[PDB]
Amino acid sequence: KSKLPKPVQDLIKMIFDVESMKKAMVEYEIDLQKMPLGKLSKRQIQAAYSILSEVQQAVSQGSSDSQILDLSNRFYTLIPHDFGMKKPPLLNNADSVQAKAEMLDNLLDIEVAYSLLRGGSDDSSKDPIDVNYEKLKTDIKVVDRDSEEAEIIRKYVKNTHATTHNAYDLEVIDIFKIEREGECQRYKPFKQLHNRRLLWHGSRTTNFAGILSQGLRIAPPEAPVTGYMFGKGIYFADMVSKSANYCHTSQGDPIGLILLGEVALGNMYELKHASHISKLPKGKHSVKGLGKTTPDPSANISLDGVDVPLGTGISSGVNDTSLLYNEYIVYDIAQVNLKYLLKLKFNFKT
Numbered sequence: 626k627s628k629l630p631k632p633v634q635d636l637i638k639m640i641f642d643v644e645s646m647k648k649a650m651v652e653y654e655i656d657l658q659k660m661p662l663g664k665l666s667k668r669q670i671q672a673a674y675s676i677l678s679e680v681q682q683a684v685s686q687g688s689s690d691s692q693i694l695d696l697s698n699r700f701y702t703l704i705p706h707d708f709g710m711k712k713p714p715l716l717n718n719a720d721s722v723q724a725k726a727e728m729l730d731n732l733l734d735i736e737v738a739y740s741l742l743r744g745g746s747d748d749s750s751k752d753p754i755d756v757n758y759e760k761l762k763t764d765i766k767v768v769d770r771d772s773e774e775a776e777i778i779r780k781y782v783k784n785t786h787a788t789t790h791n792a793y794d795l796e797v798i799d800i801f802k803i804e805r806e807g808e809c810q811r812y813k814p815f816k817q818l819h820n821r822r823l824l825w826h827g828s829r830t831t832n833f834a835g836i837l838s839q840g841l842r843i844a845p846p847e848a849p850v851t852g853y854m855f856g857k858g859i860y861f862a863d864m865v866s867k868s869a870n871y872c873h874t875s876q877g878d879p880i881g882l883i884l885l886g887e888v889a890l891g892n893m894y895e896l897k898h899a900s901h902i903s904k905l906p907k908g909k910h911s912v913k914g915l916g917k918t919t920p921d922p923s924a925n926i927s928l929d930g931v932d933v934p935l936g937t938g939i940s941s942g943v944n945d946t947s948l949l950y951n952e953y954i955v956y957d958i959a960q961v962n963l964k965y966l967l968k969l970k971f972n973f974k975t
């Protein structure tokens with residue numbers, strides 16, 4: 626029987642739940658009879674990305690629906706979807722491509738989680754929670770509710786929930802301090818870079834075994850760059866609710882997970898509209914998508930030398946931007962050092 630704290634055991638059970646992984650695949654209309662969890666492979670997902678790149682190439686060149694049918698059909702051949710005996714929906718536009726690129730990104734984290742469960746050893750005498758905990762290669766500790774870092778974290782959640790995301794409110798259940806093995810060593814060239822901020826990153830519960838195991842990752846080279854607003858990087862927010870929307874929680878599953886990561890932003894390349902970049906301009910270390918609203922710059926505080934933008938939302942003074950709130954993107958996985966993992970309860974008001 627496991628000696629790990631009860632909040633840590635509940636976290637492990639939640640992230641390694643096979644029925645939740647199957648639920649996420651049904652949500653994507655994937656045919657689990659033709660392609661179950663065990664037959665999902667990096668090779669097949671990578672080939673599907675390549676077909677999405679071929680589709681996006683035809684859409685950008687104004688191909689007719691009849692011309693694009695063969696390309697669209699090719700994607701469904703690689704990633705079988707459950708449409709019975711009907712024709713699947715045609716992928717003939719940028720939005721369709723982006724939705725499928727986003728699904729494949731999630732499939733990559735789910736495959737990692739399922740591969741951890743299948744690729745080890747079987748020992749009945751050990752508690753499965755302890756066995757699964759060791760597969761993450763991440764030290765997970767419970768942060769004390771009355772500590773200084775907990776109070777700062779709770780303030781960041783309390784102050785940065787946007788008014789436009791008022792369909793739910795958030796309650797912090799557990800705060801975990803996380804240390805992925807080798808990540809601090811990887812982060813060394815960036816540990817003293819200017820503009821290091823503690824930013825949010827939300828994701829579905831089914832991604833967290835992959836995130837703790839492999840870290841935050843960038844979409845593979847096979848993925849279409851146009852499927853991502855600011856190209857293929859790792860995306861963060863300074864407003865808790867902007868990241869909490871990426872948990873995809875609901876009334877029927879109101880518990881979500883969100884990361885706090887130290888991100889070395891350095892010289893930010895400030896943008897107001899989509900830019901499907903492959904590389905940053907010389908001397909730039911990240912992209913900052915300028916939002917209309919920003920956490921009050923005067924209320925920024927420091928947590929272990931890292932700036933925490935926990936001020937309440939005010940006008941940034943930025944006009945003509947497609948973003949309501951800020952977003953930060955890095956294009957090198959080494960620029961991220963995950964610090965905390967929060968378990969949140971979403972209370973829906975709808």
Ligand SMILES: CCc1cc2ccc(CN3CCN(c4ccc(C(=O)NC)nc4)CC3)cc2[nH]c1=O
Pocket residue numbers: 730731733734825826827828832842843844845860861862867868869871952953
């Ligand atoms: C603006 C704040 C924000 C943006 C945001 C944007 C997107 C996603 C969804 N994630 C993207 C990364 N993704 C990947 C998973 C695996 C791999 C891989 O194996 N690469 C080789 N690459 C990417 C999983 C799904 C979550 C987000 N959460 C936020 O809080």
